[PDB]
Design a protein around this ligand. Sequence first.
Ligand SMILES: [Mg+2]
Ligand SMILES: [Mg+2]
Length: 222
Amino acid sequence: RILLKILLTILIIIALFIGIMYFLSTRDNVDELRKIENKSSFVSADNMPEYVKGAFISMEDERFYNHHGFDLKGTTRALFSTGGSTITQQVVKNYFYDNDRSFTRKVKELFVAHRVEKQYNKNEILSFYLNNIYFGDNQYTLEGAANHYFGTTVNKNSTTMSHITVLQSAILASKVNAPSVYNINNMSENFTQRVSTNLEKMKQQNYINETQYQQAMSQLNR
Ligand SMILES: [Mg+2]
Ligand SMILES: [Mg+2]
């Protein structure tokens, strides 16, 4: 009865912690995400070609639509197993914690992520994602980034502007979590290697066909 009381006390102190943590994450009001849709260059994911969405999904969260905010495989692999935040978690980080990165601010990010999943559908989440990540050059929306770097658009419907290519999609997708030193204006060999990996994942997961891939790989090498 002596090893049950020090087990209980530790088991309760952590539940107490987790609990307080919950209260911290509240809130952190996920209703706020709707503000992203007010950006002058907002484009929702459903108005983008499937290969544009797939560039990001295959590179950043290939099981995006499967999970409920937490990808277990990518989070165990994440615990330094030679990552690991799901696109949902990245939306929380990018909107609410544009500043800090602590273990406690990591626990409460989980609570908040579970909440955005409960309140938003996958397309909305994906749209919050692509309309609030840094693409360099002070560009925080996919469309801004596409306009700025390439003068192309990610709105499949659009007719006033050339359409973002497979390559360009991979470049912007690769940029999102690349080291800050990766410069789309002057891509290093390490950057072209990163996007080649991105392009390969799009092919492997079938967001693009061999021809799209080869043609992108070729454009990447000029
Ligand atoms: Mg992947
Ligand atoms: Mg995760």
